[PDB]
């Protein structure tokens, strides 16, 4: 479930 | 011409005549092979003892550096006065003996440690049973077997026989193998377990995905060999787990090399399988081999799952680790540059990322950096022109010694880069790499392994290790030496600072003392200290650290060494000085001799001799003698043994058990303690 978490 | 395909083969002649052989020669004089037995059933001792009985594969599968049995039936009984033959193992289209790809196996009287050879262990009628030993550095792959009989006219060789093709794998059970793992429970989990769990989600909402590695299912071993062929990996390097795991990290992804799995994150996954639909590696790997094209699609945990299958299948112990808040450094400065300006900001963080660890010595690195190596097949950054990553020594990452190959600075950034909000507005030193986990041995639970990658957040060492890593990317010199270090005694670690400037400096530093296996595999940290020192101008200062015997004596083992890290920051300049060194402890000797006949029922005298190795006097010395079946346990006390003086202790005994026995002596005094000697004795 990889997701880029925005800064 | 590169010998880079296990699948390709050359054609070895069966009648290899030499010179101008006359018409009418009678080759019936010479042995010919009527049959070859490999005892390759999955219930028989070869596959069981080699831990290869689980492969769904009817050929012989063995592990290198370990002996196995075969039987050759000849046309008449082998007669060493008149007959000469050898076994041959051959791989690739261009085998060469000096490259390890043509392997002659001589028939020898006694097997020699580490060397290819075959010993005859039984002769009956027309048959010989051979114990064949392979080299623990053998190329890993599928070999062709031949029997070659030598004659005055040349060699007579068996025909091509695919039924005797023999797989030779990495051997985590062999102490001479680079992938040796000395713990049976770890070998079962990290080699033999074909299912597992991959952790995902978020730090505070941890989820688990079951995964079927399936490394023993029909076709999978052959596919792993195929992957290395598709990499054009030279066969001569396929016995080296560093090269195998690094090729694997490239080849499991499709970029650059037509590798196994096409990465996609686009939430549509056109003309393929969505990454979240796979539940194991087998379907992916078998489709790669049958289609001979990359499979769509994967993401981090699918790459890791397939990479794990590859490693375990070939016999490299391997596991999947999950990093929560995993940083992606785009410009190799080992920090997250956050400008949010979405155009200027390129670095990013994942809720989690996961990769593999593979277990091996690192003879290309100083001792202390073997053990778990991080390898990552998920494409993120190029490493020397290809999407690959590792093997990176986890122990090197922890101490920030990211100069050691391969890709350790990138993996360090993944687990411990700082967040820099940039003029620099703010720094978050604790967000990245909040928790790192892997499946526990013998259950589906979670093992916290964060401490293997980095020191605890908030601790000075975590700062010092990070500044070391950024340095590897004041006029002060730092060195250290271990003063006369003797097994069984306290000893000093002497750190010297030399300040050649006119400046007064302050220093903040840590010391890490570790026990290491003889092969360079780290075992344990036994001492960790931080300290501060002031450095006057134009001066040298020695800081002596006492290492007490109690701190390390409980964690030693045979031929272990000690590995020390020292890292010091000059505070006024932020300069970092970082060194690492290993030392072997001087080992006091205890000599055991026996005088008289060693017969079960008569008397023999045991002589125990000990020389004081120190410049100090030993006091209240207790010597013990142990020897089950040889002597009841006995003890001798010496009140004082002067420097460099030798004492001798004679003890009469009568053994109660015949055969190969053993004598063990011990010495403990008020300072030096728990030093041993041993002697094997045969009792007639
Ligand atoms: Ca690739
Ligand atoms: Ca960056
Ligand atoms: Ca941190
Ligand atoms: Cl890809």
XYZ file of C-alpha atoms and ligand atoms in Angstrom:
695
model
C 0.000 0.000 0.000
C 2.803 2.406 -0.761
C 1.768 6.062 -1.000
C 3.832 9.238 -1.225
C 2.882 11.401 1.768
C 2.978 15.102 0.743
C 5.164 17.313 2.926
C 33.696 -14.831 -25.724
C 31.579 -14.489 -22.578
C 30.450 -17.657 -20.804
C 27.323 -15.959 -19.458
C 24.523 -18.502 -20.001
C 23.778 -21.556 -17.874
C 21.248 -22.659 -20.513
C 23.822 -22.857 -23.333
C 26.025 -25.939 -23.493
C 28.993 -27.221 -25.455
C 29.205 -30.711 -26.936
C 31.914 -32.817 -25.260
C 33.243 -35.649 -27.447
C 32.666 -39.209 -26.319
C 35.677 -40.677 -28.189
C 38.296 -37.979 -27.678
C 41.136 -39.521 -29.680
C 44.528 -37.791 -29.820
C 47.106 -37.955 -32.574
C 47.066 -40.458 -35.430
C 45.508 -43.487 -33.723
C 46.064 -46.616 -35.871
C 43.159 -48.465 -37.434
C 42.414 -51.581 -35.435
C 42.845 -50.165 -31.947
C 40.780 -52.164 -29.453
C 39.157 -49.819 -26.946
C 37.359 -52.731 -25.233
C 40.458 -52.933 -22.984
C 39.184 -49.874 -21.106
C 36.375 -49.196 -18.663
C 33.086 -47.964 -19.992
C 30.193 -46.728 -17.894
C 27.026 -48.807 -18.007
C 25.057 -46.698 -15.517
C 25.291 -43.723 -13.123
C 23.210 -43.498 -9.941
C 22.833 -40.155 -8.147
C 20.581 -41.408 -5.318
C 18.497 -38.331 -6.053
C 15.110 -39.290 -4.617
C 13.661 -36.697 -2.293
C 13.514 -39.181 0.613
C 17.178 -40.249 0.283
C 20.138 -38.903 2.237
C 21.634 -36.608 -0.421
C 18.590 -34.336 -0.728
C 17.716 -34.598 2.965
C 21.219 -33.868 4.272
C 21.658 -31.069 1.743
C 18.253 -29.554 2.667
C 17.103 -29.739 -0.961
C 14.344 -32.365 -0.593
C 11.590 -29.744 -0.897
C 12.303 -28.672 -4.470
C 9.702 -29.975 -6.937
C 12.449 -31.097 -9.296
C 13.533 -34.634 -10.112
C 17.243 -33.909 -10.707
C 19.931 -34.049 -8.034
C 20.186 -30.802 -6.074
C 23.067 -30.330 -3.644
C 24.680 -27.471 -1.765
C 28.321 -26.568 -2.314
C 31.095 -27.416 0.140
C 29.341 -30.596 1.285
C 29.759 -34.187 0.209
C 27.175 -36.362 -1.557
C 27.025 -39.972 -2.762
C 26.897 -41.326 -6.317
C 27.517 -44.765 -7.802
C 29.122 -45.631 -11.132
C 28.544 -49.044 -12.698
C 31.367 -50.060 -15.032
C 31.709 -52.729 -17.698
C 34.098 -54.674 -15.402
C 35.322 -53.933 -11.824
C 37.411 -50.769 -11.524
C 41.062 -51.710 -11.014
C 43.268 -48.766 -9.956
C 46.438 -50.547 -11.174
C 45.229 -50.380 -14.773
C 42.296 -47.923 -14.907
C 42.136 -44.146 -14.444
C 38.982 -42.015 -14.519
C 37.532 -38.764 -13.176
C 34.113 -37.143 -12.873
C 33.545 -33.840 -14.713
C 31.050 -31.034 -13.995
C 30.555 -28.574 -16.867
C 28.483 -25.398 -17.277
C 27.931 -22.968 -20.141
C 28.887 -23.003 -23.794
C 32.548 -22.018 -23.208
C 33.695 -23.848 -20.063
C 37.253 -23.225 -18.893
C 38.964 -24.910 -15.978
C 40.715 -21.703 -14.845
C 37.297 -19.976 -14.654
C 35.642 -22.680 -12.518
C 33.287 -23.709 -15.357
C 35.005 -26.990 -16.272
C 35.453 -28.909 -13.009
C 37.575 -32.081 -13.082
C 36.913 -34.220 -10.003
C 39.861 -36.562 -9.358
C 39.423 -39.904 -7.614
C 41.484 -39.436 -4.425
C 42.469 -41.562 -1.409
C 41.221 -38.933 1.049
C 39.019 -35.881 0.544
C 40.874 -32.604 1.158
C 39.155 -29.732 2.987
C 37.724 -27.150 0.607
C 38.751 -29.036 -2.552
C 36.842 -30.890 -5.244
C 37.459 -34.609 -5.060
C 35.739 -37.965 -5.032
C 36.591 -40.808 -2.663
C 35.634 -44.423 -3.327
C 33.725 -45.581 -0.235
C 32.432 -48.954 -1.469
C 33.194 -51.488 -4.200
C 30.820 -54.324 -5.037
C 30.937 -56.377 -8.239
C 31.126 -53.858 -11.088
C 30.155 -50.791 -9.041
C 31.966 -48.097 -7.076
C 30.258 -45.753 -4.639
C 31.812 -42.294 -4.519
C 31.689 -39.603 -1.887
C 32.010 -36.420 -3.938
C 33.013 -33.189 -2.212
C 32.593 -29.797 -3.917
C 34.400 -26.540 -3.242
C 32.550 -24.105 -0.923
C 33.313 -21.384 -3.505
C 31.698 -23.341 -6.361
C 29.714 -21.549 -9.056
C 25.977 -21.813 -8.357
C 23.967 -23.281 -11.207
C 22.925 -26.370 -13.130
C 25.937 -28.481 -14.134
C 26.289 -31.280 -16.679
C 27.898 -34.459 -15.330
C 30.316 -36.716 -17.207
C 32.562 -39.671 -16.423
C 35.866 -39.548 -18.321
C 38.077 -42.638 -18.674
C 41.715 -41.976 -19.613
C 43.458 -44.246 -22.156
C 46.737 -44.123 -24.114
C 44.703 -42.993 -27.128
C 42.798 -40.192 -25.368
C 39.694 -39.809 -23.237
C 36.521 -41.905 -23.479
C 33.584 -39.997 -22.030
C 29.932 -40.685 -21.300
C 27.256 -39.293 -23.600
C 25.152 -36.255 -22.766
C 22.629 -37.352 -20.143
C 20.210 -34.680 -18.905
C 19.061 -37.097 -16.171
C 22.351 -36.609 -14.319
C 22.353 -32.810 -14.607
C 23.173 -31.571 -11.115
C 22.207 -28.309 -9.409
C 24.746 -26.896 -6.944
C 23.404 -24.164 -4.634
C 24.667 -21.830 -1.928
C 25.083 -23.603 1.405
C 24.102 -21.694 4.579
C 24.938 -24.882 6.557
C 28.593 -25.001 5.425
C 30.939 -23.117 7.760
C 33.338 -22.391 4.849
C 30.551 -20.913 2.707
C 30.251 -17.124 2.364
C 26.518 -17.449 3.188
C 27.123 -19.551 6.321
C 24.487 -18.870 9.004
C 25.305 -20.652 12.260
C 21.740 -20.699 13.681
C 19.426 -23.540 12.636
C 16.191 -21.648 13.403
C 17.388 -18.731 11.280
C 18.281 -21.110 8.441
C 14.767 -22.620 8.502
C 13.128 -19.186 8.391
C 15.466 -17.350 6.011
C 16.206 -20.237 3.588
C 13.590 -22.989 3.902
C 10.368 -21.108 4.733
C 8.441 -20.569 1.495
C 5.688 -18.320 2.938
C 5.972 -15.089 4.841
C 4.445 -11.769 5.805
C 5.234 -8.276 4.537
C 4.342 -5.427 6.874
C 2.844 -2.266 5.451
C 0.373 0.495 6.306
C 1.556 3.293 8.600
C 3.530 3.396 11.885
C 0.351 3.660 13.942
C -1.760 1.379 11.689
C 0.451 -1.571 10.808
C -0.990 -4.071 8.341
C 0.265 -7.439 7.104
C 0.206 -9.007 3.662
C 0.787 -12.741 3.410
C 3.186 -13.698 0.638
C 3.969 -17.022 -1.024
C 7.659 -17.035 -1.986
C 7.282 -20.561 -3.360
C 11.002 -21.045 -4.035
C 10.534 -24.852 -4.109
C 7.672 -24.976 -6.633
C 8.243 -26.618 -10.023
C 10.092 -24.359 -12.457
C 11.162 -21.691 -9.957
C 14.821 -22.718 -9.511
C 15.208 -22.973 -13.294
C 13.660 -19.499 -13.616
C 16.188 -18.042 -11.161
C 18.982 -19.451 -13.310
C 17.167 -17.980 -16.338
C 17.078 -14.549 -14.673
C 20.883 -14.585 -14.386
C 21.167 -15.687 -18.031
C 18.904 -12.794 -19.030
C 21.252 -10.527 -17.075
C 24.156 -11.858 -19.170
C 25.833 -12.589 -15.839
C 29.208 -14.285 -16.352
C 29.024 -17.766 -14.873
C 32.403 -17.342 -13.134
C 30.795 -14.780 -10.812
C 27.707 -16.814 -9.859
C 29.417 -18.325 -6.811
C 29.810 -14.870 -5.297
C 26.728 -13.831 -3.255
C 27.721 -10.169 -3.532
C 27.475 -10.362 -7.329
C 24.383 -12.572 -7.320
C 22.410 -10.307 -4.984
C 23.518 -7.164 -6.840
C 22.537 -8.638 -10.221
C 19.287 -9.679 -8.576
C 18.581 -6.128 -7.450
C 18.845 -4.941 -11.061
C 17.078 -7.890 -12.688
C 13.935 -8.164 -10.557
C 12.822 -4.799 -12.039
C 12.196 -4.258 -15.754
C 14.228 -1.033 -16.171
C 17.500 -1.222 -18.160
C 17.654 -4.972 -18.624
C 14.235 -6.485 -19.523
C 14.001 -7.741 -15.941
C 11.149 -9.488 -14.233
C 8.656 -6.841 -13.067
C 7.398 -3.528 -14.484
C 6.801 -0.921 -11.784
C 3.666 1.202 -11.878
C 1.965 3.568 -9.447
C -0.687 5.062 -11.748
C -3.864 3.544 -10.208
C -4.960 2.162 -13.622
C -2.447 -0.561 -14.580
C -3.415 -0.877 -18.235
C -3.028 -4.340 -19.802
C -1.653 -6.063 -16.730
C -2.169 -7.244 -13.173
C -2.601 -4.455 -10.579
C 0.218 -4.592 -8.003
C -2.196 -5.258 -5.140
C -3.624 -8.403 -6.818
C -0.542 -10.631 -6.486
C -0.320 -12.881 -3.417
C 3.039 -14.536 -4.139
C 5.994 -14.718 -6.477
C 5.394 -17.950 -8.391
C 2.900 -16.753 -11.028
C 5.080 -13.699 -11.749
C 8.302 -15.687 -12.125
C 6.802 -18.487 -14.251
C 5.155 -15.920 -16.559
C 8.500 -14.156 -16.987
C 10.124 -17.419 -18.099
C 7.287 -18.510 -20.412
C 6.662 -15.115 -22.034
C 10.390 -14.175 -21.950
C 9.207 -10.589 -21.303
C 8.705 -8.359 -18.213
C 5.510 -8.901 -16.189
C 3.141 -5.978 -15.447
C 2.877 -4.758 -12.694
C 4.597 -4.396 -9.300
C 5.366 -1.959 -6.515
C 7.768 -2.132 -3.547
C 6.319 -5.179 -1.718
C 5.891 -7.178 -4.964
C 9.480 -6.463 -5.995
C 10.628 -7.481 -2.506
C 8.551 -10.655 -2.579
C 9.989 -11.781 -5.924
C 13.522 -10.764 -4.929
C 13.104 -12.767 -1.716
C 12.117 -15.845 -3.743
C 15.193 -15.429 -5.965
C 17.605 -15.216 -3.022
C 16.120 -18.046 -0.944
C 15.751 -20.242 -4.039
C 19.473 -20.029 -4.760
C 20.290 -20.531 -1.065
C 21.217 -16.997 0.040
C 19.442 -16.421 3.383
C 17.095 -13.497 2.870
C 14.325 -11.522 4.509
C 11.997 -8.603 3.752
C 12.245 -5.458 5.895
C 9.741 -2.582 6.043
C 10.753 1.050 6.685
C 7.962 3.391 7.876
C 8.380 6.987 6.636
C 10.937 5.983 4.023
C 12.784 8.892 2.437
C 13.549 9.147 -1.284
C 16.604 11.341 -1.778
C 16.719 12.644 -5.343
C 19.980 14.625 -5.282
C 22.239 12.383 -3.139
C 22.863 14.952 -0.419
C 21.493 12.563 2.244
C 18.737 14.922 3.418
C 15.181 15.819 2.436
C 15.197 19.255 0.771
C 11.698 20.703 1.232
C 11.304 24.134 -0.362
C 5.192 23.756 -0.303
C 6.880 24.730 -3.571
C 5.983 21.588 -5.533
C 8.121 22.640 -8.518
C 11.383 23.172 -6.626
C 10.859 20.263 -4.191
C 11.885 16.898 -5.631
C 12.580 14.726 -2.562
C 9.710 12.710 -1.113
C 8.711 10.351 1.698
C 6.698 7.115 1.453
C 4.266 5.988 4.132
C 6.411 2.868 3.924
C 8.951 1.267 1.630
C 10.305 -2.263 1.836
C 13.411 -4.023 0.577
C 15.406 -7.190 1.170
C 18.291 -8.196 3.354
C 20.624 -10.962 2.196
C 23.147 -12.647 4.513
C 26.835 -12.952 3.532
C 30.444 -12.185 4.383
C 31.905 -9.047 2.792
C 35.505 -9.940 1.913
C 35.591 -6.741 -0.158
C 35.014 -4.656 3.041
C 37.052 -4.551 6.289
C 36.151 -7.121 8.909
C 32.999 -6.197 10.812
C 30.702 -5.342 7.894
C 29.447 -8.796 6.870
C 26.103 -10.159 7.952
C 22.851 -8.578 6.759
C 23.218 -6.569 3.540
C 20.422 -4.313 2.279
C 19.479 -5.022 -1.351
C 16.576 -3.294 -3.102
C 15.072 -4.140 -6.495
C 12.414 -1.388 -6.457
C 13.555 1.244 -8.994
C 14.173 4.600 -7.362
C 17.661 5.948 -8.088
C 20.342 4.891 -10.545
C 23.431 3.182 -9.144
C 26.327 3.266 -11.616
C 23.936 3.693 -14.543
C 21.244 1.133 -13.629
C 18.216 0.919 -11.348
C 19.662 -1.328 -8.625
C 20.649 -0.930 -4.988
C 23.120 -2.806 -2.789
C 24.379 -4.931 -1.221
C 24.847 -2.231 1.414
C 26.261 -3.309 4.775
C 23.604 -2.583 7.403
C 26.387 -2.321 10.006
C 28.160 0.276 7.857
C 24.909 2.230 7.550
C 24.371 2.266 11.323
C 27.739 3.924 11.978
C 27.494 6.172 8.937
C 30.437 4.514 7.182
C 28.560 4.895 3.901
C 31.782 5.010 1.871
C 31.715 1.178 1.696
C 30.080 -0.151 -1.494
C 27.317 -0.449 -2.557
C 24.734 2.388 -2.384
C 25.039 2.791 1.392
C 24.500 6.603 1.248
C 21.115 6.100 -0.448
C 19.956 3.447 2.034
C 21.158 5.653 4.881
C 19.036 8.534 3.552
C 16.045 6.176 3.377
C 16.272 5.305 7.067
C 17.683 8.435 8.670
C 17.857 11.566 6.532
C 16.908 14.848 8.191
C 14.063 17.011 6.877
C 15.390 20.462 5.909
C 12.713 23.100 5.237
C 14.478 25.699 3.092
C 17.212 30.144 3.847
C 16.799 27.217 6.255
C 13.513 27.617 8.157
C 13.299 24.352 10.128
C 14.899 20.941 10.657
C 13.080 17.721 11.607
C 15.681 15.205 12.749
C 13.307 12.437 13.897
C 10.632 11.896 11.254
C 12.309 9.583 8.720
C 12.657 5.892 9.511
C 10.388 5.832 12.537
C 10.256 2.019 12.724
C 11.877 -0.816 10.726
C 10.431 -4.329 10.994
C 10.646 -7.866 9.608
C 8.701 -11.079 10.230
C 9.686 -12.875 13.426
C 11.236 -16.330 13.432
C 8.592 -18.996 13.992
C 5.494 -16.815 13.838
C 3.706 -14.118 11.913
C 4.552 -11.448 14.473
C 6.623 -8.332 13.993
C 10.310 -7.989 14.881
C 11.546 -4.447 15.521
C 14.970 -4.177 13.839
C 15.223 -0.363 13.814
C 18.315 -0.555 16.060
C 20.241 -2.512 13.414
C 20.024 0.424 10.968
C 20.486 3.405 13.292
C 21.063 4.570 16.835
C 18.066 5.725 18.854
C 16.583 9.112 17.970
C 17.579 11.726 20.535
C 20.890 10.022 21.361
C 24.167 11.783 20.632
C 25.445 8.788 18.631
C 22.574 9.138 16.157
C 23.758 12.718 15.530
C 27.409 11.665 15.311
C 26.651 8.764 12.964
C 24.614 11.052 10.710
C 27.358 13.676 10.492
C 29.790 10.870 9.637
C 27.525 9.747 6.799
C 27.168 13.287 5.445
C 30.948 13.656 5.648
C 31.531 10.434 3.714
C 28.712 11.770 1.533
C 40.346 22.297 12.271
C 43.923 20.963 12.320
C 42.948 18.174 14.748
C 44.098 14.562 14.243
C 42.407 11.604 15.946
C 43.697 8.057 16.221
C 43.213 5.203 18.628
C 45.010 2.020 19.582
C 44.195 -0.920 21.814
C 46.951 -1.318 24.385
C 48.196 -4.915 24.878
C 44.828 -6.687 24.746
C 44.852 -10.148 26.313
C 41.895 -12.531 26.315
C 40.570 -12.871 29.869
C 41.791 -9.485 31.166
C 40.614 -5.897 31.172
C 42.383 -3.711 28.642
C 42.635 -0.083 27.599
C 41.369 1.578 24.444
C 43.562 4.659 23.993
C 42.121 7.497 21.882
C 44.630 10.250 21.056
C 43.840 13.751 19.804
C 46.567 15.957 18.332
C 45.711 19.661 18.042
C 48.195 21.426 15.758
C 46.264 24.733 15.777
C 46.340 27.656 18.208
C 42.630 27.122 19.012
C 40.995 25.625 22.068
C 38.387 23.108 20.888
C 35.652 21.062 22.526
C 35.006 17.502 21.341
C 31.919 15.302 21.550
C 32.465 11.680 20.582
C 31.230 8.118 20.929
C 32.896 4.713 21.138
C 31.337 1.474 19.876
C 33.059 -1.804 20.788
C 31.834 -4.960 19.053
C 32.569 -8.682 18.820
C 33.033 -10.012 15.288
C 33.194 -13.508 13.824
C 36.498 -14.535 12.209
C 34.905 -14.115 8.748
C 34.070 -10.465 9.481
C 30.389 -11.032 10.308
C 29.344 -8.772 13.209
C 28.029 -10.535 16.300
C 27.215 -7.960 18.982
C 27.923 -4.558 20.435
C 29.268 -5.090 23.955
C 30.224 -1.513 24.902
C 28.944 1.911 23.838
C 30.089 5.205 25.381
C 29.801 8.869 24.506
C 32.227 11.378 25.995
C 33.303 15.023 25.868
C 36.869 16.313 25.999
C 38.469 19.752 25.799
C 41.479 20.184 23.515
C 44.045 22.815 24.448
C 46.035 24.481 21.658
C 49.343 23.020 20.469
C 48.856 19.868 22.504
C 48.224 16.140 22.325
C 45.714 14.449 24.639
C 45.195 10.730 25.288
C 41.782 9.566 26.555
C 42.041 6.042 27.999
C 38.853 3.962 27.966
C 38.847 0.941 30.268
C 37.257 -2.156 28.763
C 36.595 -4.587 31.587
C 36.783 -8.346 31.055
C 33.174 -8.736 32.205
C 31.948 -6.533 29.372
C 33.080 -8.890 26.592
C 34.016 -12.333 28.015
C 30.389 -13.490 27.934
C 30.020 -12.960 24.193
C 33.225 -14.412 22.747
C 33.660 -17.387 20.402
C 36.490 -19.101 18.569
C 38.756 -16.786 16.540
C 36.440 -13.836 17.159
C 37.935 -10.361 16.784
C 36.981 -7.010 18.308
C 35.694 -4.168 16.112
C 35.859 -0.589 17.424
C 34.229 2.550 16.033
C 35.273 5.982 17.291
C 33.634 9.139 15.937
C 34.459 12.604 17.269
C 32.994 15.984 16.356
C 34.964 19.177 16.835
C 32.117 21.331 18.127
C 33.349 24.800 17.202
C 33.839 23.756 13.562
C 31.450 20.756 13.271
C 34.318 18.799 11.683
C 33.920 15.036 12.014
C 36.762 12.565 12.594
C 35.709 8.943 12.185
C 37.845 5.802 12.395
C 37.161 2.071 12.626
C 39.678 -0.652 13.445
C 39.685 -4.311 14.406
C 42.068 -6.205 16.665
C 42.604 -9.822 17.615
C 43.014 -10.555 21.318
C 46.304 -12.080 22.400
C 45.341 -15.552 23.601
C 47.129 -17.096 26.612
C 48.153 -20.693 26.000
C 47.576 -23.685 28.263
C 49.469 -26.791 27.156
C 48.262 -30.305 27.960
C 50.640 -33.242 27.537
C 50.136 -36.889 28.437
C 52.889 -39.279 29.498
C 52.585 -43.059 29.553
C 50.301 -45.426 27.689
C 46.694 -44.301 27.257
C 44.919 -47.627 27.820
C 41.435 -47.932 29.319
C 42.288 -49.377 32.725
C 45.937 -48.419 33.200
C 47.363 -45.167 34.540
C 48.464 -42.126 32.551
C 49.899 -38.831 33.759
C 48.401 -35.586 32.455
C 50.719 -32.570 32.502
C 49.081 -29.130 32.467
C 51.492 -26.245 31.863
C 50.680 -22.539 32.071
C 52.909 -19.498 31.598
C 51.891 -16.146 33.021
C 51.635 -13.917 29.907
C 51.514 -10.590 31.819
C 54.045 -8.221 33.366
C 51.923 -8.424 36.552
C 51.703 -11.181 39.152
C 48.705 -13.536 39.016
C 47.175 -14.413 42.384
C 44.867 -17.224 43.553
C 45.217 -19.131 40.304
C 42.770 -22.028 39.965
C 43.555 -24.596 37.279
C 40.863 -27.165 36.455
C 41.195 -30.397 34.475
C 38.175 -31.972 32.821
C 37.948 -35.083 30.689
C 34.849 -37.264 30.647
C 35.805 -40.924 30.606
C 39.488 -40.009 31.106
C 39.619 -38.386 34.543
C 37.313 -37.375 37.292
C 37.391 -33.557 37.457
C 40.358 -32.202 39.408
C 41.584 -28.797 40.567
C 44.933 -27.237 41.438
C 45.466 -23.910 43.179
C 48.532 -21.674 42.841
C 48.704 -18.751 45.269
C 50.968 -16.660 43.004
C 52.491 -16.961 39.533
C 55.190 -14.359 38.904
C 55.573 -12.525 35.567
C 56.531 -14.747 32.611
C 56.754 -17.715 34.996
C 55.641 -21.237 34.091
C 53.854 -23.631 36.416
C 53.301 -27.307 35.757
C 50.643 -29.623 37.192
C 50.810 -33.423 37.012
C 47.619 -35.405 37.547
C 47.374 -39.212 37.489
C 44.222 -40.813 36.102
C 42.801 -44.029 34.632
C 40.259 -43.732 31.795
C 36.851 -45.419 31.906
C 35.964 -45.058 28.188
C 37.993 -46.213 25.179
C 38.303 -44.277 21.935
C 38.701 -40.626 20.997
C 38.526 -38.682 24.278
C 39.289 -35.054 25.149
C 41.071 -33.204 27.964
C 40.040 -29.628 28.772
C 41.912 -27.366 31.148
C 40.860 -23.990 32.526
C 42.658 -21.246 34.424
C 41.091 -18.439 36.459
C 42.889 -16.010 38.776
C 41.985 -12.720 40.485
C 42.738 -10.812 37.261
C 43.145 -13.104 34.235
C 40.175 -15.500 33.959
C 38.563 -18.194 31.813
C 41.489 -19.122 29.574
C 41.428 -22.657 28.234
C 43.445 -25.402 26.648
C 42.438 -28.694 25.128
C 43.939 -31.970 23.947
C 42.346 -34.774 21.973
C 43.446 -38.191 23.276
C 42.861 -41.694 21.892
C 42.363 -44.273 24.652
C 43.355 -47.762 23.469
Ca 16.286 -3.935 -14.139
Ca 17.981 15.683 -0.920
Ca 16.839 10.758 12.770
Cl 10.501 -1.229 -13.640
